[PDB]
Design a protein around this ligand. Sequence first.
Ligand code: CLA
Ligand code: CLA
Ligand code: CLA
Ligand code: CLA
Ligand code: PHO
Ligand code: LHG
Ligand code: WVN
Ligand code: WVN
Ligand code: CL
Lengths: 341, 30, 30, 36, 36, 65, 37, 37, 64, 30, 34, 481, 4
Amino acid sequence: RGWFDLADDWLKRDRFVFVGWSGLLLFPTSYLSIGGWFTGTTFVTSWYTHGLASSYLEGCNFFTAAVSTPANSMGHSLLLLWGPEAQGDFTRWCQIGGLWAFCALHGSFGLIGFCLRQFEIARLVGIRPYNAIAFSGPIAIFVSVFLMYPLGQASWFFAPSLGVAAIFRFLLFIQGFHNFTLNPFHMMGVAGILGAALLCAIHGATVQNTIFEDGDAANTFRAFTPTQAEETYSMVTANRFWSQIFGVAFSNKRWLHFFMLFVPLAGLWTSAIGIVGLALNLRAYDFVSQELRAAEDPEFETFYTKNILLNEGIRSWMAAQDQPHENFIFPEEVLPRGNAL
Amino acid sequence: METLVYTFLLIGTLGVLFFAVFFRDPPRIA
Amino acid sequence: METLVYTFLLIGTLGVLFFAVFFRDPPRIA
Amino acid sequence: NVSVAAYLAVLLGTFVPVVFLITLFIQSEARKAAES
Amino acid sequence: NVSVAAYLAVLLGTFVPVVFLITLFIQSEARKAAES
Amino acid sequence: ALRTRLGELLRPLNSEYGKVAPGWGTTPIMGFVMLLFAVFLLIILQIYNSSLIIENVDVDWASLG
Amino acid sequence: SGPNPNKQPVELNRTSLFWGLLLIFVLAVLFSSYFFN
Amino acid sequence: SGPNPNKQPVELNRTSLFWGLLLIFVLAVLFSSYFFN
Amino acid sequence: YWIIHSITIPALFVAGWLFVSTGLAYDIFGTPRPNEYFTQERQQVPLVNDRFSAKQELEDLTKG
Amino acid sequence: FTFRWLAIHGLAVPTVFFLGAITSMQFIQR
Amino acid sequence: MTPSFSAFINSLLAGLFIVIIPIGTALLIVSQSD
Amino acid sequence: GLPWYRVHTVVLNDPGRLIAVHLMHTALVAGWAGSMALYELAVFDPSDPVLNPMWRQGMFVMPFMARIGVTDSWGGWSITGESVANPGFWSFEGVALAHIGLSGLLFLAAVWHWVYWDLELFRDPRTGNPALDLPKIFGIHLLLSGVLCFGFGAFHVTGAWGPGIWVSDAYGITGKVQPVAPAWGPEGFNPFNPSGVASHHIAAGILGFAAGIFHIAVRPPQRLYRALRMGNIETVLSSSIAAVFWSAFITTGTMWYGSATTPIELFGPTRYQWDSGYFQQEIERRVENSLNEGLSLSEAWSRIPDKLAFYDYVGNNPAKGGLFRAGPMNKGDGIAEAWLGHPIFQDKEGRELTVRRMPAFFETFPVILVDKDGIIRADIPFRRAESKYSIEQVGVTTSFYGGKLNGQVFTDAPTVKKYARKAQLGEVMEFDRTTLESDGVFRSSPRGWYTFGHANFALLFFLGHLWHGSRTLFRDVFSGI
Amino acid sequence: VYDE
Ligand code: CLA
Ligand code: CLA
Ligand code: CLA
Ligand code: CLA
Ligand SMILES: C=Cc1c(C)c2cc3nc(c4c5[nH]c(cc6nc(cc1[nH]2)C(C)=C6CC)c(C)c5C(=O)[C@@H]4C(=O)OC)[C@@H](CCC(=O)OC/C=C(\C)CCC[C@H](C)CCC[C@H](C)CCCC(C)C)[C@@H]3C
Ligand SMILES: CCCCCCCCCCCCCCCC(=O)OC[C@H](COP(=O)(O)OC[C@@H](O)CO)OC(=O)CCCCCCCCCCCCCCC
Ligand SMILES: CC1=CCCC(C)(C)[C@H]1/C=C/C(C)=C/C=C/C(C)=C/C=C/C=C(C)/C=C/C=C(C)/C=C/C1=C(C)CCCC1(C)C
Ligand SMILES: CC1=CCCC(C)(C)[C@H]1/C=C/C(C)=C/C=C/C(C)=C/C=C/C=C(C)/C=C/C=C(C)/C=C/C1=C(C)CCCC1(C)C
Ligand SMILES: [Cl-]
């Protein structure tokens, strides 16, 4: 038939790994992003961007190695290898943090390709595409945290660097400079994630503990056959159990699974809204009434004020080394301390 | 006065939980 | 700010009159 | 030293969605009772 | 010139009775539509 | 269905529902124009990003005067 | 418990709805100036 | 004009009502401190 | 096949070893050696200051 | 030269190269 | 034509002759062959 | 029956009631525009256009009215501060009343279309069942949009039959609504050229007119009709949502980074102008030029306009507000009354000491004074900490040049440290906090609020694009497999 | 033609 038809037939072949049309975008972008992350964590340094060593070659381990964000002198530049910053020089491109931009961009396009892959495969198996809508959660997380937040900030420098200790630094930095725990959208995100973990554990235990005795063996994993029209566990027994233990219980399996889908997705989207708010420093950092009460009453103290003091200490004691481009020099006298208070 | 609003919201939530527990739609086999 | 409340109440009353006139229950012989 | 419209926002954003849900539920129960 | 209490009194006093009447009318119309 | 003067005036505009051109129609033209639009978007994006410096151009507030 | 024989349906016609809305809005208009004092 | 054939009835079960009331009250509890600031 | 692998895989492993042991990784990726983190003139942390002169600035910083 | 073959060797030839590089990194003086 | 404009047009070509043209060649070649 | 989240899907296969509900939404939007403009007019204070501008008073729709020509009120005042003899109907009040009347007319039209839903226009001639020829409708509406775009670019913006657009200088000192001639060269593509707007709208309008002619005349291919579901309204909804969040992201970026369509006299300074010291460098340049002419330091600083100094203030940074810090920036840091002048700090040794500017990232920043060598000479201890570089110990004295405090020198440690704390915020300014009961916590400019709202809207509409595209492409299997 |  037509070239398209033949190419569509070949891409849709039942192989070990489905390729599809979405594969043409997913496989190269994802492969390049992963390989660039490995290359950065193995060879590329962060000495000229953050003043840090972040490579196995420099002596870092799995936790401390990272693909660090570009230098604060770059701004929100695409940092193309052929761009005016690098001008085709691979060494200077790696030294200025261009590999982080490479990984971030090709990884965003890889996430788009994987979402399209979920859509394509759902259209072939003939099922509703409730995947690639669940994956919209992680997509929103990545877009808000690694793309929208640095774009709202001064440069790519304040984006999370692709590493374990780098991610921990990013957590503490955001807590210090934004008080992100106090953000209600982050609270909804935490509630969503913890509730999703709760739902996963409780649903697994409930199904495992309400199975029908469909086998004579003590180990009951064999009593489930792959094409089973009958239900393998008692929904009525599980309903009665939770109705009389917790006071409320699921009666519709459909609803239950949609709820288990909905909770983490809603949590991730709320956290994404909160991070988008943080991108412009539009943060729920402080309560004005509490600050006014503490200002006119030195004997008034709450855990919120202690958190404010902790955030101030974090900012003051991490600014010098976390933002070396600013050339912050803070004398010991102006550094906040508990005794200094 | 905001303490009154906070207490009102908390007891309203507790009452909603109470009514959801003891006045739910009774499950039946169809 | 109370002027906004007064205007809102007056406009709401006028809208209630409008809906009572043009969306009344149509009289029928039974 | 709290705000003022603050109370208006909290109370209305609590009530407007609550009365909407209650009205919808009462309408559904009315349909169920009328049909049955 | 009075506090948000005067505002709360006027806005809630207007809404609580309004939403009650709307809910009752919607329930009655729901019963009428269900039985016809 | 009510007949109106404006309805009869605009009726031919809403008459050929489901009428399609055979096969791929003008798809290559659409793809070429989309490619040109993508190139144009890349050009304007790289100008604002400062990754592309057109001569006689200064992406800066100071260019206002 | 059991089925209660005293249950009766409640009806509010549109005329009654509009009468109620008009009364509430007119009372609000009248007493708003005094509440705002 | 005439009777429209697209009109459909809306249903909210009690589980949905309780889910909605809980969501609204919990959101109010969460955002009241921030609105009061 | 296995025979092929028995030659290719060890040769590739040795090539990966020599990419680090011969110092080619430092030259290719610009990673500073342990003896060239701070120059005599520049005892501070080297940081890029301008985006459009980044190549020349890095050439000046890494010249010594 | 199959899709599985090409994908495997794409995920194997860099893997062995990086393993050799890291093993060499382990014997640097530090 | 600034060095930046040249880098952009060369970037366009490399994408065509290193990414777009080769990868499709395989798809048309191997699709037609199977 | 229908769940609560599918109710409006009753108007899916009813073109008349779909038009009715779209008319209702447009009526609501126009009514909101009119009401918001009236409320802003009731709140706005045109007394001090230079030190209490519109972006310091929380005005949201008034900047968008002023960006494209509306600059006068029926109250005898203008945004630029120039009194107008006969305002003209198209003032802010006139625009608000026009939008409210349009909202009412659209509400009446929506009522009529909801009641009169069954029209022969909405039914297919081949099969009585109602239908919409979406490609032809798209062609017609695209031609309409192209005509509107060309008319706006060629007549309104260029001033041939319009007022023009808002144009300001590089530092937002002298800006007003003026016509702009189109720029057809490459210089029309940088965002900071107002001529690019006129050239863009003219050219894009012509191209859209041609595209509308094409999409009217030519039927879609069968391949695209089956692939894109062109007989289904939901694919139109998904594509429109996609383009809508694309445009929302673009407008968010242009608002946050700055553009000729986001003037600083209408929306306030951007955060990147404070990050790079965009106004501070200009102020220092002007002072140096005045000094080179021979003018003394007091005369040189007396030459700096109050507006330019007010732009170099961290309280005007959009990245200094809070999510729940509501109200105008005047509610945040008071209303600015006058410029106090540039302070200069000298130690007992006489070295010029400079207070380091507070970065937007820091909620609280230490007070540090550095000399021309960047050596820390004086500081303010955190709370009550033992100090060796305290201002009372180094004997730092401050002198003000320009403004109210011109020629005044301060020695008292307390006033010197107070002025140092005020100077870490950029140019020193005097505020009154009694008229609005200000709390001293920085608010956000309308630029930042627009950026926040439309960025969140763009993300949620990306989610909507995903959902509705999945709905229209997998429709057959929606009830289930 | 007309799509089916
Ligand atoms: C006669 C019609 C008319 C006129 C003259 C105005 C005039 C005005 N309005 Mg009002 N308005 C109207 C109708 C009108 N309005 C209607 C019908 C609605 C309801 C939807 C509104 C809702 C409304 C709101 C909510 C607001 C205004 C505002 C304004 C003011 C600023 C306008 C502005 O910046 O727009 C900017 C508009 C755009 C940037 C949109 C551009 C169009 C996009 C880019 C099209 C993209 C898709 C397109 C089809 C692609 C074309 C393809 C191409 C090839 C051709 C101005 C005084 C603002 C104001 O100051 O408050 C009073 C404001 O906040 N208006
Ligand atoms: C694109 C939308 C948009 C944007 C950017 C703005 C921007 C602005 N508005 Mg306008 N406004 C809008 C829409 C918008 N408005 C609409 C739709 C209305 C009608 C209700 C108004 C009515 C309005 C008034 C009456 C006033 C403003 C004012 C302002 C200014 C400060 C607002 C502020 O501090 O926010 C503060 C925002 C918050 C504290 C919360 C925002 C919402 C957060 C994200 C959470 C909401 C979701 C959450 C789950 C709710 C929980 C509910 C729970 C109780 C159940 C600023 C210029 C003020 C001003 O200075 O103008 C003179 C002012 O007085 N606006
Ligand atoms: C132009 C935009 C547009 C349009 C015309 C539609 C139209 C539709 N959507 Mg889509 N949708 C959109 C944007 C849009 N949506 C976006 C941006 C999102 C992401 C959040 C979604 C997510 C979405 C889902 C997940 C679903 C729909 C569904 C529907 C259908 C029924 C909606 C309904 O009855 O809600 C009824 C809504 C209520 C009774 C109350 C909702 C009130 C919300 C929660 C808050 C209040 C908003 C406030 C009043 C105004 C918002 C301001 C505005 C600027 C956003 C209808 C075809 C549903 C459907 O039938 O598909 C199967 C469905 O399941 N949509
Ligand atoms: C996670 C992202 C994502 C996902 C899963 C989808 C999924 C879908 N979209 Mg949406 N869409 C998206 C993002 C996404 N889209 C974005 C960001 C836009 C731009 C506003 C659109 C615009 C859009 C339209 C206009 C339409 C769809 C349609 C569709 C559906 C068919 C698939 C399709 O056409 O793919 C679209 C293809 C892609 C998303 C892949 C893009 C790959 C690009 C071309 C490569 C660029 C490379 C280049 C180097 C970039 C350099 C950038 C660098 C400078 C940073 C499907 C439901 C269509 C449909 O049938 O609706 C039901 C439809 O009409 N979408
Ligand atoms: C940190 C937590 C976390 C990780 C690591 C993760 C990872 C993954 N989840 C996937 C799927 C999913 N995630 C889902 C729900 C969720 N996932 C969540 C949280 C996570 N999900 C949460 C909270 C939810 C609830 C909403 C769903 C519903 C799916 C899937 O359908 C899918 C799957 O099949 O899983 C079973 C896979 C996506 C593959 C892909 O994009 O193509 C290839 C990989 C690409 C394109 C990413 C490369 C580019 C990345 C973004 C940047 C480079 C990163 C470096 C390589 C590594 C850096 C490491 C440092 C940061 C430490 C991948 C294994
Ligand atoms: C000894 C018992 C101690 C605990 C008693 C209270 C726990 C039970 C709470 C019931 C209400 C929760 C569900 C409401 C809504 C409701 O009525 O649900 C009813 C629902 C059952 O619905 P069905 O399966 O019948 O629905 C079928 C579908 O077709 C309906 O759409 O139960 C669930 O879905 C699981 C509930 C998850 C548990 C949610 C817990 C939420 C806790 C929130 C606590 C806030 C505290 C704030 C303090 C200030
Ligand atoms: C022991 C241990 C314990 C726990 C369990 C465990 C985790 C499984 C195990 C770990 C085992 C280990 C240690 C596993 C580790 C395995 C490793 C180190 C795999 C490395 C792979 C490298 C790749 C894919 C690089 C490809 C380069 C590319 C694409 C180049 C990209 C380029 C860049 C730079 C940008 C420019 C352009 C191009 C040219 C495209
Ligand atoms: C009818 C008529 C016929 C002829 C006669 C007539 C009287 C002259 C004429 C009337 C004309 C008239 C009077 C027309 C006027 C019509 C009016 C007043 C329309 C009002 C619209 C208000 C809107 C859409 C606000 C929406 C708020 C939203 C979406 C939520 C906002 C927010 C909140 C709080 C919740 C959280 C989200 C955020 C965004 C934070
Ligand atoms: Cl503590």
